[PDB]
Amino acid sequence: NQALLRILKETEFKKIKVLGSGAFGTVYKGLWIPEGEKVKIPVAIKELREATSPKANKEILDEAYVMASVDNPHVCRLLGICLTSTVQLIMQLMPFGCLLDYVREHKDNIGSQYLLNWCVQIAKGMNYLEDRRLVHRDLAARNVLVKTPQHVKITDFGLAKLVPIKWMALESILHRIYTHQSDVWSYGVTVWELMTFGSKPYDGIPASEISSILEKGERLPQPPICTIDVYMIMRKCWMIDADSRPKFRELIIEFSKMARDPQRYLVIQGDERMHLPSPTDSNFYRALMDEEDM
Amino acid sequence: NQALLRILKETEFKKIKVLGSGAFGTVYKGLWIPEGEKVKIPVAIKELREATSPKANKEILDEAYVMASVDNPHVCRLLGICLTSTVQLIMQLMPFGCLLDYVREHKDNIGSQYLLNWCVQIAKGMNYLEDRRLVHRDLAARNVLVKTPQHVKITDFGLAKLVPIKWMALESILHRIYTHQSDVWSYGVTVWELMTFGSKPYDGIPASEISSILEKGERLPQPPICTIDVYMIMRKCWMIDADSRPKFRELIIEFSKMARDPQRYLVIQGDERMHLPSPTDSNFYRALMDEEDM
Numbered sequence: 132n133q134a135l136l137r138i139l140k141e142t143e144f145k146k147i148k149v150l151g152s153g154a155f156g157t158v159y160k161g162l163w164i165p166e167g168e169k170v171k172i173p174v175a176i177k178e179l180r181e182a183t184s185p186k187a188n189k190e191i192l193d194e195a196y197v198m199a200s201v202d203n204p205h206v207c208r209l210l211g212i213c214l215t216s217t218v219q220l221i222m223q224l225m226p227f228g229c230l231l232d233y234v235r236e237h238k239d240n241i242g243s244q245y246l247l248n249w250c251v252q253i254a255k256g257m258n259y260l261e262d263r264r265l266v267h268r269d270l271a272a273r274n275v276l277v278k279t280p281q282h283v284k285i286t287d288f289g290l291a292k293l294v295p296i297k298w299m300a301l302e303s304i305l306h307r308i309y310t311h312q313s314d315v316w317s318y319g320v321t322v323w324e325l326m327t328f329g330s331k332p333y334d335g336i337p338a339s340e341i342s343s344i345l346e347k348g349e350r351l352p353q354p355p356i357c358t359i360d361v362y363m364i365m366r367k368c369w370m371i372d373a374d375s376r377p378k379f380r381e382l383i384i385e386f387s388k389m390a391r392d393p394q395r396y397l398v399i400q401g402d403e404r405m406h407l408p409s410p411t412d413s414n415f416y417r418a419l420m421d422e423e424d425m
Numbered sequence: 426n427q428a429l430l431r432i433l434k435e436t437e438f439k440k441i442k443v444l445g446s447g448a449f450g451t452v453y454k455g456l457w458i459p460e461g462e463k464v465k466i467p468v469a470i471k472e473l474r475e476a477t478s479p480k481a482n483k484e485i486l487d488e489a490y491v492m493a494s495v496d497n498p499h500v501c502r503l504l505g506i507c508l509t510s511t512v513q514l515i516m517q518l519m520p521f522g523c524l525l526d527y528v529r530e531h532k533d534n535i536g537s538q539y540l541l542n543w544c545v546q547i548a549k550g551m552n553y554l555e556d557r558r559l560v561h562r563d564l565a566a567r568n569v570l571v572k573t574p575q576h577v578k579i580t581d582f583g584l585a586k587l588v589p590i591k592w593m594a595l596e597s598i599l600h601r602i603y604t605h606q607s608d609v610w611s612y613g614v615t616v617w618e619l620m621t622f623g624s625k626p627y628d629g630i631p632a633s634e635i636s637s638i639l640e641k642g643e644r645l646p647q648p649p650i651c652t653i654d655v656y657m658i659m660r661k662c663w664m665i666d667a668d669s670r671p672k673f674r675e676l677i678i679e680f681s682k683m684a685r686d687p688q689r690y691l692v693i694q695g696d697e698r699m700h701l702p703s704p705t706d707s708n709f710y711r712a713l714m715d716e717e718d719m
């Protein structure tokens with residue numbers, strides 16, 4: 132339990148490059164230098180923006196042990212923490228970045244088989260989080276990391292009382308209710324990000340006005356490459372009654388069915404001439420970057 | 426089968442730094458750039474020093490497929506090949522280097538648990554090679570790679586069908602006989618390298634006079650940290666009768682027995698101030714550098 136979260140000394144790692152910033156911190160590419168060793172191992176470091184107090188560190192530590200205990204091929208694990216004045220958090224570095232930036236930069240080379248398989252994998256990780264009784268609260272394409280193009284992992288979940296309005300279920304906006312079923316709403320938006328190759332949802336609509344447009348029944352529009360079979364799934368994720376939305380276990384089955392005939396369900400120009408994963412190219416990736424079970 | 430060996434294009438990888446050179450080639454730290462991707466993935470590249478011909482490449486390819494088919498936590502797998510005029514071979518890059526360079530650099534900080542556990546692991550991979558009926562032919566501390574300080578893997582085996590005199594069994598020197606039993610002889614020298622923290626075997630004896638001294642019954646001397654129990658095992662690996670030498674399956678059992686009470690079997694000054702990593706440090710290493718099953 133507590134051996135899954137490594138407490139690091141300031142001196143055994145170094146921030147070398149800024150990767151980005153979000154709501155609660157700045158993420159750096161870093162190097163871990165093990166004590167007494169000569170190697171430098173790349174890591175990702177998130178330094179929190181606000182300074183905390185030794186008793187606030189007790190709250191952080193309690194949740195951090197939980198996030199270090201996940202064990203699933205499609206869920207990132209928190210690896211370590213350094214309790215400086217501003218707390219720093221360490222996880223595995225993903226050289227491919229987040230899935231949002233990935234679908235934007237490769238939006239002219241991504242076939243339906245990849246897109247559908249990413250949907251399957253994100254649903255697998257969320258179903259695991261539900262089994263562990265962990266609500267994500269901030270599912271979005273930026274919080275799905277690409278370990279390899281064939282293997283994505285959910286990250287930055289579990290942050291309970293520590294706002295991404297345009298990804299949140301109506302009841303989360305109005306009442307601060309976060310459940311596994313509002314994660315299903317955020318899943319639909321995340322899929323919409325992938326199918327639009329990374330468009331901003333509700334572009335140009337002020338966040339303070341989103342719950343008004345949701346209450347009047349407007350939802351994100353049908354992405355051009357999405358058939359209606361895919362679009363109904365996304366829309367069912369945005370039902371006002373949370374208990375009527377699909378469950379993650381069901382979303383696994385439906386997108387796995389569609390992934391077995393991906394060109395029937397996504398309509399992409401050039402899809403027949405698009406890279407798909409050969410066993411040779413997959414064996415190479417896993418041996419170089421991705422040795423974990425799946 | 427042949428999906429286990431990736432055939433690479435010249436343009437998808439680059440040599441960036443020379444790591445060392447041996448009998449048949451020069452090893453580089455390199456980078457793989459996947460087609461259509463932006464990331465740069467570190468690899469190790471061995472360029473053979475003599476250029477080959479398309480028909481000689483068929484021989485190389487037949488063997489490269491066999492070396493790409495090993496699956497054991499303690500045996501490195503060949504990952505890819507590029508058929509340039511001088512052939513280039515690609516495998517995982519080990520930032521810790523080979524065990525010979527590592528034991529030399531940490532010779533004042535290596536405890537008995539590590540050394541005995543390295544002997545076990547080297548024996549596990551060799552026993553696997555024997556189960557696969559693959560003769561190593563060039564086992565030596567330089568051909569054991571450190572994936573993490575806790576996990577070593579044997580490399581550069583199998584150049585059979587197709588000289589390190591001081592690691593070779595007498596029958597291999599005199600008769601070019603290489604068997605699993607002569608690998609056991611090379612294992613004995615390898616353990617001697619580790620227990621002397623990387624001393625050169627038979628230092629000051631010309632290689633051309635080695636078969637003379639072995640026939641006369643001379644062997645490597647007992648390293649200062651080895652009890653008679655450990656040295657007796659090494660000596661049994663250097664018996665002239667190949668079938669009287671221990672089997673790798675036996676060497677696993679015996680060195681595991683010693684690793685469960687390591688200070689009784691190795692006498693290292695300061696050993697009580699150096700032990701294995703806690704579970705915390707093993708979990709951290711494995712998540713960052715070493716996700717494979719064991």
Ligand SMILES: O=C(Nc1nccs1)[C@@H](c1cc(F)ccc1O)N1Cc2ccc(-c3ccc(N4CCNCC4)cc3)cc2C1=O
Nearest residue numbers: 158175176177190191198207208209220221222287288293
């Ligand atoms: O480290 C993460 N991302 C990374 N990117 C790159 C490198 S690390 C993810 C993350 C990584 C995972 F691998 C898995 C899950 C996960 O959530 N975390 C973990 C985490 C734990 C705790 C906190 C936390 C809790 C409480 C408080 N305060 C102020 C308000 N009131 C109470 C006291 C401040 C901060 C934040 C995070 C977080 O952002």
Ligand SMILES: O=C(Nc1nccs1)[C@@H](c1cc(F)ccc1O)N1Cc2ccc(-c3ccc(N4CCNCC4)cc3)cc2C1=O
Nearest residue numbers: 452469470471481485489492501502503514515516581582
């Ligand atoms: O590449 C290896 N090391 C590495 N270091 C860093 C990067 S790659 C290991 C290696 C790596 C492993 F991961 C596992 C086993 C293994 O052996 N190989 C593999 C290999 C295959 C073939 C050959 C080969 C075969 C025949 C010939 N002929 C042609 C006919 N006329 C003249 C000579 C020349 C060369 C050599 C090797 C070799 O050295």
Ligand SMILES: Nc1ncnc2c1ncn2[C@@H]1O[C@H](COP(=O)(O)OP(=O)(O)NP(=O)(O)O)[C@@H](O)[C@H]1O
Nearest residue numbers: 150151152153154156158175223224225228229273
């Ligand atoms: N483990 C990681 N490896 C590589 N890049 C990462 C990693 N974690 C996060 N990033 C990148 O770091 C940047 C900022 O991450 P983060 O601060 O979590 O912001 P965000 O996810 O964009 N926003 P937020 O919704 O608040 O979590 C993003 O571009 C991520 O792609």
Ligand SMILES: Nc1ncnc2c1ncn2[C@@H]1O[C@H](COP(=O)(O)OP(=O)(O)NP(=O)(O)O)[C@@H](O)[C@H]1O
Nearest residue numbers: 444445446447448450452469517518519522523567
């Ligand atoms: N995968 C690897 N990762 C990192 N370093 C490596 C790797 N493979 C080999 N090396 C290093 O590269 C150098 C040369 O490798 P190599 O050409 O096989 O020579 P060698 O094994 O030392 N001698 P030989 O018995 O002739 O093969 C050595 O210093 C090794 O430590």
Ligand SMILES: [Mg+2]
Nearest residue numbers: 153273274287
């Ligand atoms: Mg994030």
Ligand SMILES: [Mg+2]
Nearest residue numbers: 447567568581
């Ligand atoms: Mg070698």
